[PDB]
Design a protein around this ligand. Sequence first.
Ligand SMILES: [Mg+2]
Ligand SMILES: [Mg+2]
Ligand SMILES: [Mg+2]
Ligand SMILES: [Mg+2]
Lengths: 359, 359, 359, 359
Amino acid sequence: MKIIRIETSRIAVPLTKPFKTALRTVYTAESVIVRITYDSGAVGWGEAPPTLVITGDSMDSIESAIHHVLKPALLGKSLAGYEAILHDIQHLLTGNMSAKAAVEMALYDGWAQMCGLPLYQMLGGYRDTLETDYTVSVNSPEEMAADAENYLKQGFQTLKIKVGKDDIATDIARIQEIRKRVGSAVKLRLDANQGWRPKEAVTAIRKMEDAGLGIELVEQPVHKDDLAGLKKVTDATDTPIMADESVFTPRQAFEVLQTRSADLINIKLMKAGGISGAEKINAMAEACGVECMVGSMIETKLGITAAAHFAASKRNITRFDFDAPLMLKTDVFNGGITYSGSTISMPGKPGLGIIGAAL
Amino acid sequence: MKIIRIETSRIAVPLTKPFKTALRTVYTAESVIVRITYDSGAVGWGEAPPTLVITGDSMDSIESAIHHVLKPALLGKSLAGYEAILHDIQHLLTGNMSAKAAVEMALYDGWAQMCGLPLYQMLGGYRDTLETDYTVSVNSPEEMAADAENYLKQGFQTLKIKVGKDDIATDIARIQEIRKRVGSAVKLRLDANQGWRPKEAVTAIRKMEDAGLGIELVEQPVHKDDLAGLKKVTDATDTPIMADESVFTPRQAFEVLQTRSADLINIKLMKAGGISGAEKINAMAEACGVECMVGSMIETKLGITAAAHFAASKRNITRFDFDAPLMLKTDVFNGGITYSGSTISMPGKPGLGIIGAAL
Amino acid sequence: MKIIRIETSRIAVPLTKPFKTALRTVYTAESVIVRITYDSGAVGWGEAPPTLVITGDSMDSIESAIHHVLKPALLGKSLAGYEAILHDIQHLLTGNMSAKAAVEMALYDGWAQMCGLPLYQMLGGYRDTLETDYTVSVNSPEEMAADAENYLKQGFQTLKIKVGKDDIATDIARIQEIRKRVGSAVKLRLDANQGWRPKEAVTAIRKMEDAGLGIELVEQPVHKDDLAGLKKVTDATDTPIMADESVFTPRQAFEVLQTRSADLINIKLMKAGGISGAEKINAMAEACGVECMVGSMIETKLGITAAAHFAASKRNITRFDFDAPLMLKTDVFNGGITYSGSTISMPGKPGLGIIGAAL
Amino acid sequence: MKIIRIETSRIAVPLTKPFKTALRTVYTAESVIVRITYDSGAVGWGEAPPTLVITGDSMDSIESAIHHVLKPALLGKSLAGYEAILHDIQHLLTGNMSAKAAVEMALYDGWAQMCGLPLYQMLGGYRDTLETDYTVSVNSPEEMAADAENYLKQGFQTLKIKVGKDDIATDIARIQEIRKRVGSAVKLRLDANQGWRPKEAVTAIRKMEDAGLGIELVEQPVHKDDLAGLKKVTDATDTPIMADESVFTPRQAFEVLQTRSADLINIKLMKAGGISGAEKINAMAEACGVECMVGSMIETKLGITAAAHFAASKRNITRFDFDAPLMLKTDVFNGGITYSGSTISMPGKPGLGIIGAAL
Ligand SMILES: [Mg+2]
Ligand SMILES: [Mg+2]
Ligand SMILES: [Mg+2]
Ligand SMILES: [Mg+2]
């Protein structure tokens, strides 16, 4: 079992290098941290960063949401009736998806703790390890290529290249400089972050294909609301197109799957309001032959631990984008998932396996 | 929790009175029962009856499938990796949805026994009681009206009325003679079990609406594959139309929801290959703003216990159709859910709470 | 002009009688008051209340969005370039529509002040006065009838009846008591606040038509996301259907107009993120032959004042729902619009006509 | 504010050389000029030329409509109620859009003058400068390459190439010869002015794509009433298609956007009946995520100034086609915008900044 306390606190950990996308730049990772204590003494953990240009959630909005709305309705409830709690978390307020997701992470932590198994095993237990990409931030062709060379040196053979921030011809210059420096063996994932127009993206993606640049997929090439435009890019190229900002919820997912506007979907807990929605998105996509990748916002190893446990559980989730914690100057959590280069291994303790604040 | 043994065995229980729909007549309920023994000594339980005109599964087809295909893939497997087991169950053979389902009930029974809670609570535990309807089998207008009076006396204020066997005129005459004899307070569901052409249906449904006969919903008025025809009935009436035989799988549900060919869905474990599919259908429907009913085939209390635990677990499952065990001369199962009038209660025992066969 | 300072504060003013709809109950009116100071020393005013179940906006989320995001991009900007300002307001953060709206109210106030005319004349100046309705909150039939009789005595011949909270039969009994008590001369607006299913709503609206209850229109009978269901009710009845929670933004309005899912649109500043988006929603709607009503959330005379100025300016805005400030124990603003019973009159000052805090 | 007098006159400025399109040839630019005199002594200015094969408007029909229909509704009205004046302009007669537009120009000129700001700032003031293209008229492949070379020398790096007059073969040869003589750095816009069948159009655009001729976009490739053919070109090429003569009004834009029959829209004051309609088209397109160009007919600086004040005001307007006045032998207005090679600049005077006629 039973919820009996919900607390929050803040963390702020500067990034080593600034993370740069077409939407935003981030110098310091901010995050609200949620702790649910249950009647057994056991503690469930949770996280939500501010993403004002993606979800609209600020640190203030989240902490308010959790204390004023979610907390009064959750105190005293049992994990034996977790469906009623999930419904409450998702319908006692509209929007506020990052708040809902922090609370759901702690909830699933204690639920698997209650059942006595690691959370990823509780949800299907499909794999014990998984490979994460590393993100190359948008910068000059030269900076991006040296970033990529170093990430390959750290053990990462799959790089996620941010593009779409200014003009398209420079994006191509960026990829060629990365390819000419790193070799044609490594997998390159593009993410345009809504920065291209559909016909523009088609022409550029064919140009990259034809130059043998070896693009694995392209994330959300067009504006999130332009579903028909996304379909156009998907239908026009040989390169897999992955919806991201287009699909937050199950309802939005259903719309993308039915129109067939994309080949892959990017699932994030912040977007889906936690694991319950992420799981619903993946299942619906699995039935349509649509594979999913699980990523994150700029989050600590906590929120990546929740994401990895969910991503680890499902057969249909075949890619993983869990590089955020490696971007920070310090690791502010004890336990959870462990990295070994690109390989993320799952823990053995019941739940998320997050012991607590690091030292 | 390792699976070490898979046992099957048959039963045969008479029906007090024959069960009559537009597709079939049942005099005796026959069923394959599955028992999965785990390395803990725990036993998980499952059921699948033959429904040759519905699923095409027979007792021979079901047993063969379980022993020649599913059993070799489940022995040695643990329940900490159920995603891979569920996938094997659904993909190592096509169709055979009844046999897949028996094995899934026992698997989920096992999985919930491992975590020390009732199965319904493991799947969400939204409610612990629920109201079942009772089915008025197709007969003469007088013969059906008697049955209706008698079920109301037993405490069943929601009656499901089988139609679609004969012609329209007699169907309207049956609902009249039922309404007359039972007053305008009790809920009346209809279930044509595919017996009407789309035109026939619109005409018959509208006639009833204008006569004030108060029909809650009509199940599958037309042929299961006539999807456009299901939609025409949905869109030309003011009565909720529930898909049944047109929706077995999550892919079939997705198509029905996308085209909006119906307002509701009937989920059965037999049709959906077990619980994993049932859950996926309901979750899709929920994402589209559509509630579901969970019913069954002619099953004993064991199969109804599995269906009830699933139905009890989800907010978006709001109607229940678990009258089948009450048609039988004997209740051949000890433990499981409990009837008391129209009310079914979820016991506090772990798993499905089946102790064994009756004495 | 130029923006030189942006400040916020809060008010909290009890309701005389509790406001009740199918979504929420409100006992006290809370709100954030924005104050933009310009280089001439002139001040522009705005407002946003929390509506956590409608917009997702809380007082903490609003205040934080203003100070952390909108203020540092507005400071030093001229109302000569107000389109870049409006684009920044809308695109610097996703969501936060109530925060965007409150700032937009103060921007438009300042912009009209500059031009030396009342805001409503700067925006078109179509009428000097307008008739507001008064909302009868959801209670028992007798309480709703008593309220309605008293609202008529205070001079309100157009009443807005909140239905949709419980079961439909009780709703018809409410309208019936109100009609029997107030006579057939008054105009009766209904608002179900998403409370009805599509088919249930159709049958219920025709029942009211048949019974001669003389319903002017029905606001958002069904869930916001179910546009096709909203379309079904629009097409099935003779009674005008108005979209409300279905239409926040110009883009959402485009979708409701393209699909023809409603005869009318309810515009609110909180939903559209201000007046610019509100203005666009009305313009598209006029081009489609679709009249609009402008309402509000539970807001003081300040936010109603901005809403009325917008509302008075445009020909296609033919209905008005500005009763919220009359529900409050105290009128906490000085100036702005004035009431004589149900009649609202626009002020002659440049801008909104809001002097300051009340005596 | 008050309108006290509406005067009209004609002018005829020679064109240095002929403007040629698929639709028409223009040797001399004739125009009706509207001055509106307000009770302050302020004078607003407007222009409408005759475009018999585009709008159907002639000088007699413009003057007639202004004097018989529009003037009687305008005299004695004040700009504090511009919404009602605008509505009388658009609805007291059907068609006569060039007449509507000329009067709107003088009205908006007056409105901006009452508030002491340039019109462009009054409507939003997004930008101060803008780059106009220059139009290469239809002649022989050689003559068009010489014009293009010359225009690049005069500062114009963006060229609009008129095509569609005779046949495909020659059109292609013109773009190739222009490309040769001008290099691949300069931007190339085509405008076919309704001169291609849809199949013909796809073929020719596809030939140019494969020959690497770098076509930014194509204006109205097909007949203006042929909406489905416009959509076929749009959907079978990777080159943006911009609707022109297809889209006069908000209603027409709404349909084009609804069906996605084009990627872009050309807005002209003459087609929209003025700025109120142009503003409405631009806002609709913004809601659908589509940018617009603003153009003109063959107009003098007065009409280009009014268009450029609109185009400068809105963010979503990102292309500009204001070359007509430069094709003329004499500049017969002092004031207005100013040219500087390809750069158009917005004056600082209230309203259009037009002082008066030629010396
Ligand atoms: Mg992405
Ligand atoms: Mg059925
Ligand atoms: Mg409403
Ligand atoms: Mg053109």
